[PDB]
């Protein structure tokens, strides 16, 4: 459901 936490190339 989510998508990223962060910016940094997404640190999904």
Avoid: C, I, L, V
């Amino acid at each position: 459901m989510m998508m990223k936490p962060d910016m940094m190339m997404k640190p999904d």
